[PDB]
Structures are given as structure tokens and as C-alpha cells.
């Protein structure tokens, strides 16, 4: 019903192929001006799809010599219709990005192209920049290293290639701006997101968070870490393998109360040092050194969990990164507090039109339709894959597993074909590297600290005798071109190591191996004491694993473990799915509140006269004050109007500017109107006292500071309530329902605090 | 004595329960009475209607 | 205890199977009720 | 009114109300299906020494089967224990076991009710070609139970939540018009009805004042790094209900009190048969004391099954939540269980009072013949009404966001 439509449009573009093949180079550069003049006449983007794709399909051949396939045209139309276009891993999914971005950049509004990491961003940006800048448009590029002027010139171009973290951080640093011309990102139009199962599925959990500075404390971390250094590995603390949660035992609690001299660890007085013991314990035994970070040049530089790259700017929250820096004897940088927060779901729900593509999406088509209202189109390949996904040789121990990995890489190096060795962590990669060092194999390690060498390795890793050990930098999106005579031997032979947390992440390595119909061999070599099995393995299989002996020279052949592997990884992907469906409906509350507060902050920013809005804030504050001091079910003769005029003379007016004999016993709305008459006279006197130019800047500084400070405080209180909202289900209530009601209540108290504090600071000075 | 001390603990613990106050109490009982009265009227109308339908069609 | 829970689980189901003929003179219905940040702003 | 007038302006809430009332109309037109291949009017002419339709069994097998599954998701069955500890993935498999166990349990209980009916009627209701007619009755009642489940799932999907509880509520409040026209044919004319209405409103506000009552325990997570806007008494806690058991112990005491009369009716007339009928009379104090002590014992039992201090203290230890002054491992279990000792005594005495309310109410009012005001149905009406209205108020308070710009 749609695939035949895509085939029909692809045959139309292939039919009008012959008209644009004999044109000059200046004709195709004039052709984008012709399309833009045609869009400035009354034509929609959908009526010009066939001519636009014919022009791009000629221009890409003119630039790079490669010519788009009819399958790629099907994918381009399925991207332009606004839903996810799944193509198999290695079939040409950057030229299917090249197709609709031209048509949707003709409107004059910007088109963002999203990808997972800066290497793929740079590669796609240079190649498609050659295509588009031959064709006529202008192409930006967004990085972590760019200044705000270079970012503004990048978004100011027609087409922007970027990652996801930098789009989220630019949005959050544009909703933290003081001027309307200082912010970076344009109003959002269209985002062709690449590796959608990575960005909107795997990483939707995790939010982008820009944090501001805070005051520094240091005397707790060192002491807490000093105390944890001397604990016993299972007598004092219990490291749960499954959920990675650490708790002290009762002997450990007694040792804590003995070491710190306190009478009771668990109390309201010692919640700070209880937190520091918990975070020092988590930093010592929960996360390991090269597994979860990297120590470069005197600072803890963490690795990303999903793409395995070196996040050189980000810091752990809740005072964990300071506990790591106190663990390894570094200097303790000052702790921060949250200034803004978004998720990738709530960020990419702000684009006017989404479009996406990946290699594996029919696993998550249901969640795509239920969240983003995007359905997955399954698209052919036009050449069948010759890649043979051999079954996974499941061994018994880690030592025998890596021994068999080294034997396989030696056997395939002696015949002369490339081998890529998948990994997850980076100390496992160093282990495989020093295991292949003392055998005679010139390998070439691809760590989380070797990104210039990522560029050269991926240039020189499809040659006659190259061996690569890749943690996650060549585990998604990375293409490897086969050298001379290589595909006559088999091409890349991906020898995977660890079974990942998804079939998608598993199949991406298979996609590295086999591309464009070239052959390729994949074999996972996983153990039975891997991190996956040791965390989320069935207890009966770990009991019945005893019947296999100890000789780890041959893989375990029985089907019980070959059922337990898929059972464990379906368990971990179901746990991630359930954790996402708990996070979605709890972040929709802050989605509502954040869109309200950011829209109103932006219309504060781009306004030129804040007089009526500041007066309305003062009216709301003053009517809440008189309604709080003059109750209606209580007798109208006893209202404590002396206390009312004391509060008004303290907050709003001067000392002797109001007394009880001025107004007494009158109706409260006319009392509100009289005090607002006094407010407007004092406001006009102050506005004439230092000019009606500095007054608007002064009140704009006060309003923006109020919004930013109370929104910071409300994010912190909202997270503190989201911690313990799940305990409410012990009264058979609904925790989401109680979360929504109490979140609305504290949102209204936030707005009341904003209005009261801006009224006090405006009418103070 | 177990009985007297236990009953003192019970009557002391009943001072630390979040009881409803008077306005929430009268709002809740107005909700309950209005709901049960509306559904008596509603199912009585449907009872008379299905009685007329089974009298006519049978 | 472990004997107590299985004894109650047998006894409730058995006497519910017995009193499947219910509501002899009455009526009963029943009811059943790690994140990291990017610095600066 | 103001609140329902605000309800009937929002399109989403209005569509949910229309869908819920439409499914209740579907429930009533499914209730009014007489003679499902059964006796014609023997249920009307042989009732007294009364509800019989395709919905005569109801969702009571679903209730008691989910009770049995809630008892079996503990250390009794290790397969169900690892289903319960295997995240939100195995709960669907446990609910599938609940569904199939419900189907087979209702298939047994419909045959048991049919055997009780043709034993109390002397078999003079319909002729039998064999066991196939009883199998047909069992298929009809099991399909009616599954149809009530489908309506409950439709109401908890697109209606206003808790569809099984709304079906139970609708089945309860559909007989009170027959109670009203019987008491109007029956009819001190006022002055006694005013006393009855004052008593009913006093029992209503007592049920409100007990059910909407929480004993909150202050849980403090350690994760407060600094002050970082300390409001004071923070709004995180562990709310324990005063009566955690629900209404289930009424069902347990009624079942265990009417099953020995069933086995006494099976054995025929005997001296011990007449003795156990007189001692399980449920109106005389000799049986009433047994009913009260079964209420109290099984509400302690099902309160400890419902609020489980072992798993609660373990969950608080794993999440980091402690009580100020109380260690998370085992002192938290002891503290929570010696709070629950004190709360469920009050819950026990309240639910025993409302359980023995209708017999004293009828015996000291004497004007209605068979109107049970108290008992279980009062708690069902109160709970479903309050929960539905809190759901609708939350669906509006999600909408009414204001802002600060004016
Ligand atoms: N139309 C085409 N004609 C010839 N070669 C192509 C065509 N489209 C893509 N390719 C080549 O096929 C390979 C596919 O790589 P890439 O597009 O990076 O894979 P993915 O789709 O996973 O991103 C690229 O090397 C590209 O050079
Ligand atoms: F889907 Be491709 F391999 F990036
Ligand atoms: Mg790619």
C-alpha cells in the first residue's frame, strides 16, 4: 500500500533520468534557483519530489562517481514522507540521506542531520558537502569544539550535520540566554536522524543536561574515600552483581559509626556523610577504571556507555565524579547543580517534521508507532547478502574464550584476510591487544583514546593483512572498504567477543563485516562467565553448568546454554523497555511544565515593553497577599489590616506610605485597586527617576534571573519527588497520578514564588 | 502487662494517622451520595427501558 | 511460615470449591486492588 | 454542581464518561438475557425455601483466582517466585497463568453451583440428556465471565480506569432500584426513614474516614547532597493504609462459614447437621462470634500478604531509602511490622463492624425484608466512587496549567 507507491515514484525518477544526464554544470547550479523560485510560486514539496531526486541523482554521480540505486530512491521517498526508512546494514544509507535533505532545504528553513558521533558527522558532512555545494546549497557542520559564532554560522547554513548531544546542548543553552540575538539555534524544521535505534531507542532514557557551577566542598570526599579504602569485599559491603547496587552490611555500619565517631549513621543529622559513604562505595566497587572512564592528563574523562567514545566535557551527577577523583588521588573540582534538563524523546518531539533511518528497526516498530507516531518501512537491498552469520561458539571460561579468539585471529592472519575484533569495554581491548602481542600478529588496537588513529585505522583496515580490535568506535555506522584481492578471500571477518544488550547492537557488527554484497564471516565467541550472564543469567542454568567439566579447549555444544543466552539478552532488553516506559510518563509532566516556562521566558526575552507584564505579576502577587490576609469565611471585622499594611509597606511601598486609616473595612478588590494605584504612581516615579530606557533592562534582568533561579530549584525539587514517588503504591494509589497532582501543585507554588520575588525586587529598588 | 501496654501503643499510634478533615470529608460523602443516587436513577431508567423492550419485542 | 502458606493456599481453594454453591441467604462481591551532565550555561 | 459541569466540557473526559456509561449499558443488556438453555421460571417459583443469568457467576472467580496467584507469588512455588522477581517481563506470564486458572476454576464452580441448584430445587428445574447440558451451562457461564473480563479491559483501557471494579460496582448498584420499589411497596412512615437515612449517612462518613486514612512513614533518601531548597517536611514517605486488606477477608469469612452448611446439606438430615446449621447460623451470636474471629484472623493474614514487611524492607535497603534512626536491613522490617500490628487491629475492628452491620440493621429496623446496606457492597461502592472521581480530577488538573505572563 506504500511499498508499491515507493516503487512507482522510483520508476518515475528512473524514467526522467535521461532528461538531466546531458546538462551542463551551470545548469544544475541554476536548477536549485529554479526550484526555489518554483517553491516561491505556490508549489508544495511533495509535487516536486521526482524532479528533486532526479537532480540529486545526477549531481551525486557528477561529484563522486557513485550513482544512486532505485532502492535508495525508495528510501529517499520514505524519508520525505516523514517516517522511518529501515534499510539493511551497509546498503547506502548516507546517499538516502542526501536525497530528501536537498528537497526539504529548498524551503529556506534549516535542515538538521543527526548522527551518533563526530566521526560519522564529519565523514557524511564532507562527502555530502561536496555533493550539495556542487549542487548549490550551503552546508554547515556542528561540533563540540566550536564557539558560538561558528555554531551560529553553522546553523545559519541551509543544512547542518551534527550529533545528538550537541543539538540538545545547543537547545538548552539557547533556553538559558539573555538576548534574542545571542541564541544559536534556528526555529526547528526537519531532522533526518541517523541510527534511530541508537538515538531514540537506546539513548532516549538518558537526558542531555547542561549544568551550571556551584560552590565547592571537599572535606567530605577525601574522608569518605579514606574510610572506604579499608573495607572487606563481602564482609563489609555487598556488591550486588545484577543491579550494581552497593550497601554496607551491619558490620560496615558499625565500622562507619566507629570511624566517624557518630552515634547513628542513618539519621537526619548525618545524611550528608551517609551520601558520601554511599558515593565513595559506588566509585570504588560499582564502576571500574577503564571499564567506565579513562584517566587522561590529570582528570577523570569518562567514556560514553553507548558509543564508547571519550566524553571530554561531561561530569557524573550527584557527586559521583568527585568521589572518583577522590578515589584515584586527583584534585577535587567543585560540584555543580542542574540548570536545565531534557530527554532525547522530548527534544526530537519538538521538530516540525521527523524522519529517520537505521539498520534494525522492526524489533522496535511498535515503540516507534506508540511514541513518535512514525512507522517503519522495510526496504530491500537489490543485491542479496553473502554474509554467513555463523552460530556463536559458546565457551566456558574467559581465559579459554580469549585463547580461542587469539587462535582464530592467528588462523585468519596466516591466510591473509582482515579481522575486526568487537569488544565492549576498553581494558578488554587492551587484554586482547597484549594477548595478540606475544604471538606474532601485527594488530592495531582501536581504543577509547585513539580517535586520530580511528581515522587512519578505518582508512587502512581493509588491506591485505590488517587486524583491528575495536571497542565501540567501529561498532555502529563505520564503513570499511575492502582493498585489492581481499573480497576474493572473504573480506572482513568480524570476531565478536561479548554478547551485547540487544540484537540490534549484535547485528551492527555483522553489518561491518558484510557490505554491498561482498562476502564476510561473523562468529561471536562468548563465554558462560561474561558480564551479561553473570548479571542476568538464570539461576538453574548456573546450577546445572557443573556438568561440563573443566577442559575449556572446545566450545560447549549443548542447547541449554544456547537457550540461556537468548533468554538472558531478551531479559535485559525487556528490562530496558520497562525502564523506558516508566521514564516516559514521568517525564511528560516536566515536558508540560518546561514548555510552559520556556515559551513564557522566550516571550519575555523578545519583548520591548515589559511594563504590563511586570504590573500583572505585581497584581497577582498583591491579590494573593490580600486574599491570604483577608479570609472570606471569617468575619469581615477582624482582618489584621495592620499586618496587611505592614507587609505592603515592607515589600512594595515605603514605610509611612500606607496605614490603616487610609483604607479600612472596604471591599478587597477596591482595596487591591487602591494599592495598585499607589504601585503605578511609585512605578512611574521610579521610571522618571532614572529614565524609561534603563528601567526595562533592569526589570528584564530581574525577570530572567527569577525564572532561571526558580526553574533550577524546581528541577531539583521535582527530581527529589520523582525519587520517592514509587513508594506511594503501598496505599494502593497510583504513583503517576499522585506525581501529576503534586507536580502541578509545586509548579503553581513555583510561579507564585516567581511573581512574589519579582514584585519584591522591582518595587524595592 | 501486655494488654494495657499494647492498647496504650495502639491509642498512641492512632494520633499519627493522616485523617481526613471536615471539608474533605463532606466533599467525599457528597461525591459518594451523588454517585450512588445518579446510578440508582441511571440503572432504574435502563431497567424500565429494557422492560419496555422485552415487553414489546419479546 | 512455609507450611502455613501452603496450608492456607490449599484450604482457601478447597473450601471455595466446596462453597461454590454460594449466596444461600446473602450476597458478596469482593474486589482486588548513571546520569551525567555537561557543564556551564 | 460545579465539578461535573467542568467535566462535561472537556472532550477527552467527556468521551471517557460516554464510553464507560455505554459499556455499562452493554453490561445491563448482557445481564437481561434470561434462560441460557436452562429452566424457564424455576428460579422465580422455587427461590425461597436469586440472580441467575449468563452473568450469575460474575468476576468472583477472577477475584479468588488472583488471590490464589497473589498467595503463590511467594516462596511456595519457586517458578512463580522467579516470575515475580523477573521484572515486569514475567508479570504477563503470571497473569496468563491467572487467566487460565480462572477459566478452569470457574468451569469447576459453575458446575458446583448447578449441583447446588438442582439439589436445593429437588432436580425439578429441567430434564437432563446427560452431562452435556451441565457442560453447556459451564460453557455459558465461563463465556459470560470472559465477556465481563473483556468489558472490564475495555473500561480500564479507554474508559476511566479500574474496569473490573466498575463492573462490580455496576452489578451492586443495579439491585438497589429493586430494593427501593420493594420498600416503596412496603411503604414511622417518615420519622423512621429519617432515622435510617441518618444512620446510613453516618456509616458512609465512617467508611470514608477510615478508608481515606493513611499512616505515612518518613522515608529519607541519602541522596540529598546539600540543603538544595529544603522545604522542610519533604513530600516523600511510605503511606500505609489503615485497613490494607481491602474487602477480601469478608469473602474469606463468608466462604469458610457457608462451606460446612454445604457439606451438611450434602450428607442429608442428621443431628450433627442440624447442630452445625444452628451453630453456623450467622445471625445468632454463636455463629457471629466465629464470623468476627475469622474476620480478624484473616485480615491480619491478608494484611501481611498485601503489605509485606520483608520485601518492603529489602526494597528500601536496595533503593537506599531508610527511616531516620532505623537501619535498612532488619530493623526496618521490625519497625514496619510493629506499625502494621497497630494499624491492622483498627482495620480489623472496623471491617468486622461493617461485616456484622447488616444483620443488626435488619433486626433493629425490621422494615426491609432483605436489604443488605452494610457488608462488602458498601466498601465496594465507596472505593470505586472515590477512585473514579480522583482519576477524573487528576485528568483535569493535568490540563489546567496557567503560567506567569497574564
Ligand atoms: N549508488 C551507489 N553506487 C555505488 N556505490 C554506492 C552507492 N551508494 C553507496 N555506495 C557505496 O556503498 C557503501 C555504503 O556505505 P554507507 O553508505 O556508509 O553504509 P551505511 O548505509 O551503513 O551508512 C559506501 O562505501 C558507498 O561508497
Ligand atoms: F546502516 Be549503516 F551501516 F550505517
Ligand atoms: Mg552510516
UniProtKB/TrEMBL annotation, chain B:
InterPro entries: SecE_bac, SecE_sf, Translocase_SecE/Sec61-g. It is a single-pass membrane protein. Keywords: Cell membrane, Membrane, Protein transport, Translocation, Transmembrane, Transmembrane helix, Transport. GO terms for molecular function: protein transmembrane transporter activity. Belongs to the SecE/SEC61-gamma family. It comes from the Bacteria. Its main location: membrane. One of its GO terms (biological process) is intracellular protein transmembrane transport. This is Protein translocase subunit SecE. Essential subunit of the Sec protein translocation channel SecYEG. Clamps together the 2 halves of SecY. May contact the channel plug during translocation. GO terms for cellular component: plasma membrane. Component of the Sec protein translocase complex. Heterotrimer consisting of SecY, SecE and SecG subunits. The heterotrimers can form oligomers, although 1 heterotrimer is thought to be able to translocate proteins. Interacts with the ribosome. Interacts with SecDF, and other proteins may be involved. Interacts with SecA. It holds the Pfam family SecE. It is found in: Cell membrane; Membrane. The chain crosses the membrane at residues 25-46. The keyword Ion transport does not apply.
From TrEMBL, chain D:
The keyword Cell membrane applies. GO terms for biological process: intracellular protein transmembrane transport; protein targeting; protein transport by the Sec complex. It is a multi-pass membrane protein. SUPFAM superfamilies: Preprotein translocase SecY subunit. Its main location: membrane. It is found in: Cell membrane; Membrane. Keywords: Cell membrane, Membrane, Protein transport, Translocation, Transmembrane, Transmembrane helix, Transport. The keyword Signal does not apply. The chain crosses the membrane at residues 17-35, 54-76, 97-117, 129-151, 163-184, 188-210, 247-268, 288-305, 339-365, 371-389. GO terms for cellular component: plasma membrane. InterPro entries: SecY, SecY/SEC61-alpha, SecY_CS, SecY_dom_sf. Belongs to the SecY/SEC61-alpha family. Component of the Sec protein translocase complex. Heterotrimer consisting of SecY, SecE and SecG subunits. The heterotrimers can form oligomers, although 1 heterotrimer is thought to be able to translocate proteins. Interacts with the ribosome. Interacts with SecDF, and other proteins may be involved. Interacts with SecA. NCBIfam families: 3a0501s007. The central subunit of the protein translocation channel SecYEG. Consists of two halves formed by TMs 1-5 and 6-10. These two domains form a lateral gate at the front which open onto the bilayer between TMs 2 and 7, and are clamped together by SecE at the back. The channel is closed by both a pore ring composed of hydrophobic SecY resides and a short helix (helix 2A) on the extracellular side of the membrane which forms a plug. The plug probably moves laterally to allow the channel to open. The ring and the pore may move independently. HAMAP family: SecY (MF_01465). This is Protein translocase subunit SecY. It comes from Geobacillus thermodenitrificans (strain NG80-2).
Amino acid at each position: 500500500r506504500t511499498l508499491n507507491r515507493y516503487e512507482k515514484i522510483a520508476n518515475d525518477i528512473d524514467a526522467i533520468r535521461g532528461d538531466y544526464e546531458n546538462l551542463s554544470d551551470d545548469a544544475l547550479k541554476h536548477k536549485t534557483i529554479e526550484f526555489k523560485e518554483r517553491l516561491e510560486k505556490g508549489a508544495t514539496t511533495d509535487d516536486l519530489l521526482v524532479e528533486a531526486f532526479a537532480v540529486v541523482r545526477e549531481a551525486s554521480r557528477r561529484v563522486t562517481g557513485m550513482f544512486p540505486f532505485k532502492v535508495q530512491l525508495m528510501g529517499g521517498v520514505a524519508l520525505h514522507d516523514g517516517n522511518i526508512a529501515e534499510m539493511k546494514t551497509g546498503e547506502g544509507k548516507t546517499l538516502t540521506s542526501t536525497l530528501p535533505v536537498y528537497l526539504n532545504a529548498l524551503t529556506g528553513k534549516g535542515v538538521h542531520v543527526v548522527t551518533v558521533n563526530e566521526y560519522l558527522a564529519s565523514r557524511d558532512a564532507e562527502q555530502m558537502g561536496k555533493i550539495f555545494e556542487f549542487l548549490g546549497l550551503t552546508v554547515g557542520l556542528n561540533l563540540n569544539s566550536m564557539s558560538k559564532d561558528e555554531k551560529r554560522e553553522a546553523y545559519a547554513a541551509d543544512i547542518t550535520y551534527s550529533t545528538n548531544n550537541e543539538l540538545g546542548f545547543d537547545y538548552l543553552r539557547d533556553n538559558m540566554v539573555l538576548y534574542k540575538e545571542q541564541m544559536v539555534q534556528r526555529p526547528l524544521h526537519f531532522a533526518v536522524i541517523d541510527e534511530v535505534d541508537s538515538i531514540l531507542i537506546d539513548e532516549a532514557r538518558t537526558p542531555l543536561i547542561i549544568s551550571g557551577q556551584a560552590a565547592k566542598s571537599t572535606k567530605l570526599y577525601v574522608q569518605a574515600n579514606a574510610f572506604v579504602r579499608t573495607l572487606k569485599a563481602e564482609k563489609d559491603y555487598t556488591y550486588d552483581i545484577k543491579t550494581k547496587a552497593v550497601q554496607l552490611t551491619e558490620e560496615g555500619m558499625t565500622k562507619a559509626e566507629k570511624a566517624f565517631g557518630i552515634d547513628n549513621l542513618f539519621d537526619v543529622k548525618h545524611v550528608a556523610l551517609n551520601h558520601h559513604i554511599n558515593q565513595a562505595l559506588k566509585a570504588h566497587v560499582a564502576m571500574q577504571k577503564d571499564v567506565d572512564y579513562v584517566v587522561e592528563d590529570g582528570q577523570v574523562v569518562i567514556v560514553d556507555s553507548f558509543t564508547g567514545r571519550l566524553m571530554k566535557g561531561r561530569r557524573y551527577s550527584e557527586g559521583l565524579h568527585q568521589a572518583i577523583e577522590a578515589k584515584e588521588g586527583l584534585e577535587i573540582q567543585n560540584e555543580s547543580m542542574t540548570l536545565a534538563t531534557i530527554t532525547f524523546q522530548n527534544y526530537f518531539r519538538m521538530y516540525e517534521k521527523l524522519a529517520g533511518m537505521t539498520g534494525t528497526a522492526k524489533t522496535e516498530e511498535e515503540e516507534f508507532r506508540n511514541i513518535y507516531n512514525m512507522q517503519v518501512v522495510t526496504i530491500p537491498t537489490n543485491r542479496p547478502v553473502v554474509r554467513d552469520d555463523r552460530p556463536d561458539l559458546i565457551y566456558r571460561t574467559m581465559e579459554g574464550k580469549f585463547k580461542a579468539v587469539a587462535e582464530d585471529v592467528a588462523q585468519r592472519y596466516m591466510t591473509g584476510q582482515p579481522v575486526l575484533v568487537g569488544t565492549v569495554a576498553v581494558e578488554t581491548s587492551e587484554l586482547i591487544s597484549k594477548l595478540l602481542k606475544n604471538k606474532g600478529i601485527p594488530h592495531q588496537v582501536l581504543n577509547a583514546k585513539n580517535h586520530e588513529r580511528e581515522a587512519q585505522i578505518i582508512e587502512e583496515a581493509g588491506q591485505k593483512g590488517a587486524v583491528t580490535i575495536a571497542t565501540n568506535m567501529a561498532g555502529r555506522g563505520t564503513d570499511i572498504k575492502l582493498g585489492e584481492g581481499v573480497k576474493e578471500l572473504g573480506g572482513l571477518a568480524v570476531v565478536g567477543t561479548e554478547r551485547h544488550e540487544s540484537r540490534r547492537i549484535d547485528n551492527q557488527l555483522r553489518g561491518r563485516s558484510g557490505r554491498q554484497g561482498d562476502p564476510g564471516i561473523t562468529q561471536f565467541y562468548l563465554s558462560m562467565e561474561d558480564e551479561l550472564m553473570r548479571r542476568f543469567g538464570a539461576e538453574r542454568t548456573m546450577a546445572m553448568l557443573d556438568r561440563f567439566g573443566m577442559d575449556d579447549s572446545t566450545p560447549i555444544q549443548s542447547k541449554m546454554v544456547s537457550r540461556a543466552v537468548e533468554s538472558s539478552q531478551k531479559r535485559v532488553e525487556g528490562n530496558n523497555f520497562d525502564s523506558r516506559k516508566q521514564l516516559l510518563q514521568y517525564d511528560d509532566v516536566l515536558r508540560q511544565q518546561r514548555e510552559v516556562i520556556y515559551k513564557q521566558r522566550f516571550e519575555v526575552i523578545d519583548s520591548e515593553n515589559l511594563r504590563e507584564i511586570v504590573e500583572n505579576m505585581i497584581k497577582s502577587s498583591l491579590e494573593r497577599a490580600i486574599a491570604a490576609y483577608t479570609p472570606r469565611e471569617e468575619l469581615p471585622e477582624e482582618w489584621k489590616l495592620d499586618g496587611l499594611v505592614d507587609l505592603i509597606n515592607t515589600t512594595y511601598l515605603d514605610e509611612g506610605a500606607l496605614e490603616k486609616s487610609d483604607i479600612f473595612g472596604k471591599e478587597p478588590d477596591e482595596m487591591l485597586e487602591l494599592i495598585m494605584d499607589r504601585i503605578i504612581t511609585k512605578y512611574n516615579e521610579k521610571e522618571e527617576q532614572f529614565g524609561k530606557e534603563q528601567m526595562r533592562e533592569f526589570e528584564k534582568v530581574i525577570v530572567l534571573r527569577a525564572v532561571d533561579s526558580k526553574w533550577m530549584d524546581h528541577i531539583d525539587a521535582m527530581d527529589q519527588l520523582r525519587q520517592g514517588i514509587h513508594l506511594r503504591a503501598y496505599a494502593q494509589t497510583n504513583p503517576l497520578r499522585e506525581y501529576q497532582m503534586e507536580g502541578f501543585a509545586m509548579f503553581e507554588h513555583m510561579i507564585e514564588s516567581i511573581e512574589d520575588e519579582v514584585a519584591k525586587f522591582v518595587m524595592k529598588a | 502487662q501486655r494488654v494495657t501496654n499494647f492498647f496504650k501503643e495502639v491509642v498512641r499510634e492512632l494520633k499519627k494517622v493522616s485523617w481526613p478533615n471536615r471539608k474533605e470529608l463532606v466533599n467525599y460523602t457528597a461525591v459518594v451520595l451523588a454517585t450512588v443516587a445518579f446510578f440508582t436513577v441511571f440503572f432504574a431508567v435502563i431497567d424500565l427501558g429494557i422492560s419496555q423492550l422485552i415487553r414489546l419485542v419479546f | 511460615a512455609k507450611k502455613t502458606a501452603i496450608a492456607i493456599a490449599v484450604a482457601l481453594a478447597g473450601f471455595a470449591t466446596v462453597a461454590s454453591y454460594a449466596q444461600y441467604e446473602d450476597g458478596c462481591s469482593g474486589e482486588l486492588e548513571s546520569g551525567y551532565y555537561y557543564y556551564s550555561g | 454542581f460545579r465539578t461535573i459541569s467542568n467535566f462535561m466540557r472537556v472532550s477527552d473526559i467527556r468521551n471517557k464518561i460516554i464510553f464507560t456509561l455505554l459499556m455499562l449499558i452493554v453490561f445491563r443488556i448482557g445481564t437481561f438475557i434470561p434462560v441460557p438453555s436452562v429452566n424457564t421460571d424455576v428460579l422465580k417459583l422455587q427461590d425461597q425455601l436469586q440472580n441467575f443469568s449468563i452473568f450469575a457467576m460474575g468476576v468472583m472467580p477472577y477475584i479468588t483466582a488472583s488471590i490464589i496467584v497473589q498467595l503463590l507469588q511467594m516462596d511456595v512455588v519457586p517458578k512463580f517466585a522467579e516470575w515475580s522477581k523477573q521484572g515486569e517481563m514475567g508479570r504477563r506470564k503470571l497473569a496468563q497463568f491467572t487467566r487460565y486458572f480462572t477459566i478452569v476454576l470457574g468451569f469447576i464452580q459453575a458446575l458446583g453451583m448447578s449441583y447446588g441448584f438442582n439439589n436445593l430445587a429437588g432436580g425439578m428445574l429441567i430434564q437432563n440428556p446427560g452431562i452435556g447440558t451441565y457442560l453447556l451451562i459451564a460453557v455459558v457461564l465461563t463465556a459470560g465471565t470472559a465477556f465481563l473480563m473483556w468489558l472490564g479491559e475495555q473500561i480500564t483501557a479507554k474508559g476511566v480506569g479500574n474496569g473490573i471494579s466498575i463492573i462490580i460496582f455496576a452489578g451492586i448498584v443495579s439491585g438497589i432500584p429493586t430494593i427501593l420499589n420493594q420498600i416503596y411497596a412496603q411503604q414511622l412512615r417518615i420519622v423512621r426513614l429519617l432515622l435510617v437515612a441518618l444512620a446510613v449517612v453516618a456509616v458512609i462518613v465512617g467508611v470514608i474516614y477510615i478508608q481515606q486514612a493513611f499512616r505515612k512513614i518518613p522515608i529519607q533518601y541519602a541522596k540529598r547532597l546539600e540543603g538544595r531548597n529544603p522545604v522542610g517536611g519533604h513530600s516523600t514517605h511510605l503511606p500505609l493504609k489503615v485497613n490494607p486488606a481491602g474487602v477480601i477477608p469478608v469473602i474469606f469469612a463468608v466462604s469458610f462459614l457457608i462451606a460446612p452448611p454445604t457439606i451438611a446439606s450434602f450428607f442429608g438430615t442428621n443431628d450433627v447437621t442440624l447442630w452445625i446449621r444452628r451453630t453456623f447460623d450467622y445471625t445468632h451470636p454463636v455463629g457471629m462470634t466465629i464470623y468476627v474471629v475469622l474476620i480478624i484472623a484473616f485480615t491480619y493474614f491478608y494484611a501481611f500478604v498485601q503489605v509485606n514487611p520483608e520485601q518492603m524492607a529489602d526494597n528500601l535497603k536496595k533503593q537506599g531509602g531508610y527511616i531516620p534512626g532505623i537501619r535498612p536491613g532488619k530493623n526496618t522490617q521490625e519497625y514496619v511490622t510493629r506499625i502494621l500490628y497497630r494499624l491492622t487491629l483498627v482495620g480489623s475492628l472496623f471491617l468486622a463492624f461493617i461485616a456484622v452491620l447488616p444483620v443488626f440493621f435488619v433486626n433493629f429496623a425490621n422494615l426491609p425484608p432483605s436489604a443488605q446496606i452494610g457488608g462488602t457492597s458498601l466498601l465496594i461502592v465507596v472505593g470505586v466512587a472515590l477512585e473514579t472521581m480522583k482519576q477524573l480530577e487528576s485528568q483535569l488538573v493535568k490540563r489546567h496549567y496557567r503560567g506567569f505572563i497574564k
